[PDB]
Amino acid sequence: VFASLPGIIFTRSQKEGL
């Protein structure tokens, strides 16, 4: 969800790892 939104992609990084 975060990835799609303009918000920070921090969460996305966690999903994959670091």
> What token pair was written down for 2?
């975060």
> What are the C-alpha distances in Å from 9 to residues 5, 6, 17?
9, 8, 12
Question: At 3, which amino acid appears?
Answer: A
- Of residues 1, 6, 7, the one with CA closest to residue 15: 1
Helix (H, G, I), strand (E, B) or coil at 13: helix
Q: Quick one: tokens of 8?
A: 């920070």
Cα gap 18→16, rounded to integer Å: 7
Experimental method: NMR
**Cβ pair 10, 17 in contact under 8 A:** no
Tokens of 3: 């990835």
